[PDB]
Amino acid sequence: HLEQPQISSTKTLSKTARLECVVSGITISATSVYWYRERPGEVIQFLVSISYDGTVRKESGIPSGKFEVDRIPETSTSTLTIHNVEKQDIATYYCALWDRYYKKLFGSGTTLVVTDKQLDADVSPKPTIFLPSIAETKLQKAGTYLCLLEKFFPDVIKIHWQEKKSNTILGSQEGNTMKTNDTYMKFSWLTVPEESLDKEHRCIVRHENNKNGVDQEIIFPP
Amino acid sequence: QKVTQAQSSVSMPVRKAVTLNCLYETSWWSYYIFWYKQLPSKEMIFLIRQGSDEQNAKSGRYSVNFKKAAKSVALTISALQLEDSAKYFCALGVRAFLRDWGIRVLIFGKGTRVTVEPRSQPHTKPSVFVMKNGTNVACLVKEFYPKDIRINLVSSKKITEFDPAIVISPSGKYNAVKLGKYEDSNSVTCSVQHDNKTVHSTDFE
Amino acid sequence: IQRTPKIQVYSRHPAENGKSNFLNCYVSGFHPSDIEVDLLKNGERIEKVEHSDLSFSKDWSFYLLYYTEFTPTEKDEYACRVNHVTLSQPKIVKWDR
Amino acid sequence: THSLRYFRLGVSDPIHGVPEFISVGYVDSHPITTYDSVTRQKEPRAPWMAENLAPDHWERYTQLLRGWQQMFKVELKRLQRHYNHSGSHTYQRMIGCELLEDGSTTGFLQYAYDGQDFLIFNKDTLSWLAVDNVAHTIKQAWEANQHELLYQKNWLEEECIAWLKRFLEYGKDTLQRTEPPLVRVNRKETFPGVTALFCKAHGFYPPEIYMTWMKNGEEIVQEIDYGDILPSGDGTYQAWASIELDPLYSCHVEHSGVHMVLQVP
Ligand SMILES: *[C@@H](C)/C=N/c1c(NC[C@H](O)[C@H](O)[C@H](O)CO)[nH]c(=O)[nH]c1=O
Ligand SMILES: *[C@@H]1O[C@H](CO)[C@@H](O)[C@H](O)[C@H]1NC(C)=O
């Protein structure tokens, strides 16, 4: 199993940036890690590969001294370092490893954002609570709670609708990431039946610029 | 070594079958063909594997019609579902018999976008509901067939109106929610145009 | 549907003038089975040429192998005449050192 | 990976290339069984096949093959009755298994008309796959006899795996990797002037081999041209890989669990 903790990484023009990829089960010292780039409206292409012994390999069309790969045995994670980042590097990066013993596993994916100047504003997603009317909760006997997120630039977002006990509920429904002035805004909702109408549902949103570093939590009363 | 995918976007109804023709150009004697399903949430998932000297692979709902001389790897789905709406990838790999040392590189393709439209279902009456918080007001529509709906909201003074994104409900119909910023808080009415009938917000109230 | 044969002329061991080797005329990817193969030596066909049995392949096509002990030389030129239904003209593939 | 496949040929009218019915069995790449319409008897093709098997086994399958030869003539006349084709044509059959090195089971049965997929069998659904309207009539004719189709499914699952595992034990000269390749790099030219690095490897067994070219420490993607794994004639195989030279190039070989490295002199 492969998992990339970073969902998005916003880096300033012509600067160094590190991308995370953590392994599960098998150790990095025994296997080889591969790195891929998924360009918008293009093909998924290979970048760099680090062998189990320690040797590094690349692809035709990569300059000498642009990408760096390291796998620490203490932490058991693979990291890709991108030097002198340009506009042509804006893509969803994936880390790969060969499964037992035919298929090839792939990471969650990390989209790269490149800007001219540094972010001089709070790009944290602003939460807005939306409670349904009495007419929908009484006649249909099913409530519909909506969550409104705005004032965020990386645009790479993940919306989860749970309960008091952390478990992903089927039927979560979301729209599209709308572009306003220079920032972005996205909305999502959940329709729960009479069985879980008394249960207090909680909505969790994953983003790079979340408060205190940890994931953002939004509470909805029943 | 290159993988070509002519199909860019394919629209197919539920329960039916869909064939995705993939072409490849390579030189090795022994090789593998990998098919991947990339979810809109950036989730890459393995589906099936096809060997050069191997017989046409079948992994449940997924089956590949392998043409060796023609160099075609067409993947056919037995029965279509709701969760099938994702981007499909066609990959090319080598057949080596040693440790996985950094050389086993997959040659991917352009990709094929699949948008599964709902199956032949009867017409359902649309129910309009409303919700608000300060300046932003949202209107919800549930259980209606087909996608043809002219949803509108009447306001005294409007600042910005956002386009409504339509999503498929697991019940067997469509679901649409529209919102925007308004100066008025206690005066909001909606009129819809679906199945030649108009339903107001006061009908349920 | 008809299939044309893929003729491949080579040697069992690496080329060296003096030491005895085996001449191989490997045909593959042909349909139907009826074929006429004759190993040539400076234009003249060799009287005694040993051959493998008509082998079957997974793609419904057939493949054969013709072998005979020969002494390679810089002056002498070798080839093999192949005659099939698809070949309107009996294709002659020249062997390269 | 190990495999056991049995083939059947059915030529309508014979010419200089006699006979009409030929049935040859294979274990991975080597022939094991031999049967022809000239001499209606099951003959061995491998030295290890002649031994370890009683004369009763050879005699039992002879009468079975004599019956399948008679069935093939009936299927040929039926094909000439349905289709408008009349003269000299080919009717093929292929039954086989692929026992994987991990322990995965894969069974298959196929019928062909003039080197084209006529009817393909599906064991999970217990029904045939028709290619067109003409193939649909024979599909219905075979689908009627339920117990006949169930025998084909039962044979591919338990009997076929047991037959292949018995032959692999009988042939030690199949499991052996006692034949390493001879990788030698040679500079070749076709027309003046052209330069190419030919990484020629010969005298290897099993035919399963991997070759690649590496520039300093990077594989030459979408440039390397590959040859064919050809039989030498003395139970060994040969293969090559060429790359266009320009003013470090290393050839990498993978055979018998040994990684061979060759630097350009
Ligand atoms: C001797 C072992 C030769 N057998 C042979 C077979 N055997 C497989 C199987 O018994 C047969 O195909 C049945 O008809 C399946 O229902 N098949 C073949 O084509 N040729 C042979 O020489
Ligand atoms: C309205 O939204 C704000 C956040 O913007 C929240 O603090 C408040 O509780 C919400 N009120 C209701 C009734 O949803």
Instruction: Return the domain boundaries, chain D.
Output: 1-176, 177-264
> Which residue's C-alpha comes closest to atom 9 of ligand 2?
A129
Tally helices (H) and strands (E) across chain A.
1, 19
CA dist., res. C93 & res. C81, Å (int):
7
At the fourth CATH level, which superfamily is domain C1-97?
Answer: Immunoglobulins (2.60.40.10)
CA dist., res. A132 & res. A135, Å (int):
8
Residue C54 Cα, ligand 1 centroid: separation in angstroms? Answer: 18
CATH of domain B121-205: 2.60.40.10
Decide whether any atom of ligand 2 lies within 6 Å of the B133 Cβ: yes
**Beta-bridge partner residues of B9:** B113
Q: Counting every residue, how long is chain B?
A: 205
Say whether both A112 and A14 belong to one domain: yes
CA dist., res. D45 & res. D25, Å (int):
9
Residue A197 falls in which region: left (phi positive, over 0), alpha (psi -120 to 50) or beta: alpha
Sign of CA dihedral B145, B148, B153, B159: positive
Say whether both A79 and A7 belong to one domain: yes
Say whether both A7 and A111 belong to one domain: yes
Residue A124 is encoded by which pair of tokens? 């944290």
CA dist., res. B109 & res. A157, Å (int):
26
Say whether both A82 and A35 belong to one domain: yes
| Cis before C43 (ω within 30) | no
Q: By three-state DSSP, how is residue C30 classified?
A: strand
> DSSP of chain D, one letter per residue?
-EEEEEEEEEESS--SS--SEEEEEEETTEEEEEEESSS-S-EE-SHHHHSSS-HHHHHHHHHHHHHHHHHHHHHHHHHHHHSS--SS-EEEEEEEEEE-SS----EEEEEEETTEEEEEEETTTTEEEESSHHHHHHHHHHHS-HHHHHHHHHIIIIIHHHHHHHHHHH-HHHH------EEEEEEE-SSSS--EEEEEEEEESSS--EEEEEESSSB-TTT-EE---EE-SSS-EEE-EEEE----EEEEEEETTEEEEEE--
Per domain, the residue ranges of chain C are 1-97
Tell me the residues of chain D between 99 and 118 that have a Cβ less than 8 Å away from chain A.
102
DSSP 8-state class, residue A83: -
Query: Which of C15, C27, C26, C28 lies closest to C70 in space, CA to CA?
Result: C15
Residues of chain C with C-beta less than 8 angstroms from the C-beta of D24: 53-56
Tell me how crowded residue D250 is: count the other CB atoms within 10 A of its CB: 17
Q: CB B53 to CB C58 under 8 A? A: yes
Domain that holds residue A137: 119-222
Going by the annotation, the residues of the binding site of D are 8, 23, 42, 57, 93, 151-152
Q: Counting every residue, how long is chain D?
A: 265
Residue D150 Cα, ligand 1 centroid: separation in angstroms? Answer: 16
Could you tell me how far CA A20 lies from the centroid of its own chain?
11
CATH of domain D177-264: 2.60.40.10
Residues of chain D with C-beta less than 8 angstroms from the C-beta of B29: 226, 228-229, 239
> Which residue's C-alpha comes closest to atom 5 of ligand 2?
A128
Residue D82 Cα, ligand 1 centroid: separation in angstroms? Answer: 26
CA dist., res. B120 & res. B78, Å (int):
18
Residue D26 Cα, ligand 1 centroid: separation in angstroms? Answer: 11
CA dist., res. A143 & res. A129, Å (int):
14
Q: CB B133 to CB A170 under 8 A? A: no
Question: Which ligand has the shortest distance to the CA of A130?
Answer: 2
Q: Counting every residue, how long is chain C?
A: 97
Decide whether any atom of ligand 2 lies within 6 Å of the A219 Cβ: no
Task: Please name the CATH architecture into which domain B1-120 falls.
Answer: Sandwich (2.60)
Q: Structural domain tally of chain A?
A: 2
> Which residue's C-alpha comes closest to atom 5 of ligand 1?
D6
List residues near ligand 1 (CB under 6 A).
D 6, 8, 23, 25, 33, 35, 42, 61, 65, 95, 152, 155
> Which residue's C-alpha comes closest to atom 11 of ligand 1?
D95
Residue D31 is encoded by which pair of tokens? 């022939």
Could you give the residue ranges of the DSSP H alpha helices within chain B?
none
CA dist., res. B88 & res. A23, Å (int):
25
| D33 at C interface, C-beta within 8 A | no
Identify the burial level of B131 via C-beta atoms within 10 angstroms of its C-beta, where 0-12 means exposed, 13-18 middle and 19 or more buried.
Answer: buried
Q: CB B98 to CB D254 under 8 A? A: yes
Neighbours, chain B (3 or more CB pairs < 8 A): A, C, D
Residue A45 is encoded by which pair of tokens? 């292409």
Q: CB A148 to CB B133 under 8 A? A: yes
Question: Which ligand has the shortest distance to the CA of D7?
Answer: 1
**Beta-bridge partner residues of B173:** B169
Please, what is the end-to-end C-alpha distance for chain C in angstroms? 36
**Ligand 1 pocket mutation, candidates D8, D21, D64, D147, criterion most atoms within 8 A of CB:** D64
In this structure, are strands C50-51 and C62-70 parallel, antiparallel, or unpaired? antiparallel
Q: CB A140 to CB B127 under 8 A? A: yes
Residue A8 Cα, ligand 1 centroid: separation in angstroms? Answer: 60
Q: Which residues contact A212 (CB under 8 A, 6 or more apart)?
A: none
DSSP 8-state class, residue A133: P
Q: Which residue of C has its CA nearest to B66?
A: C59
**Ligand 1 pocket mutation, candidates D8, D95, D156, criterion most atoms within 8 A of CB:** D95
Say whether both A131 and A208 belong to one domain: yes
Sign of CA dihedral A204, A207, A212, A214: positive
Residue A103 Cα, ligand 1 centroid: separation in angstroms? Answer: 34
Contact B152, B191 (CB under 8 A): yes
Query: What is the least distance, in Å, from the CA of C43 to any CA of chain D?
Result: 23
**Beta-bridge partner residues of B87:** B38, B113
Decide whether any atom of ligand 2 lies within 6 Å of the A128 Cβ: yes
CA dist., res. D151 & res. D145, Å (int):
10
Chain B and chain C share a number of CB contacts under 8 A equal to 3
Please give the number of the atom of ligand 1 that sits closest to the Cα of D61: 1
Contact C34, C85 (CB under 8 A): yes
Residue B72 is encoded by which pair of tokens? 């075609």
> Which residue's C-alpha comes closest to atom 17 of ligand 1?
D6
Q: In degrees rounded to 5, what are phi and psi of residue C34?
A: -60, 110
CA dist., res. A158 & res. B181, Å (int):
24
Q: In the β-sheet with D116-122, what is the strand arrangement from edge to edge?
A: D43-44, D30-36, D21-27, D2-11, D90-99, D107-113, D116-122, D127-130
Query: What is the least distance, in Å, from the CA of B114 to any CA of chain A?
Result: 15
Residue B8 is encoded by which pair of tokens? 């860019």
CA dist., res. C28 & res. B68, Å (int):
15
Q: Which of A97, A118, A139 is the last residue of a domain?
A: A118
Say whether both A102 and A123 belong to one domain: no
- Establish whether domains B1-120 and B121-205 are of one fold: yes
Q: In degrees rounded to 5, what are phi and psi of residue D56?
A: -65, -35
Per domain, the residue ranges of chain B are 1-120, 121-205
Decide whether any atom of ligand 2 lies within 6 Å of the A131 Cβ: yes
At the fourth CATH level, which superfamily is domain D1-176?
Answer: MHC class I-like antigen recognition-like (3.30.500.10)
CA dist., res. B93 & res. B31, Å (int):
6
Q: Which of A118, A151, A176 is the last residue of a domain?
A: A118
| B34 at A interface, C-beta within 8 A | yes
Contact B146, B196 (CB under 8 A): no
Residue B76, CA distances (Å) to B7, B18, B22, B59, B178 in order: 14, 6, 11, 11, 37
Are 3 or more Cβ–Cβ pairs between D and A shorter than 8 Å?
yes
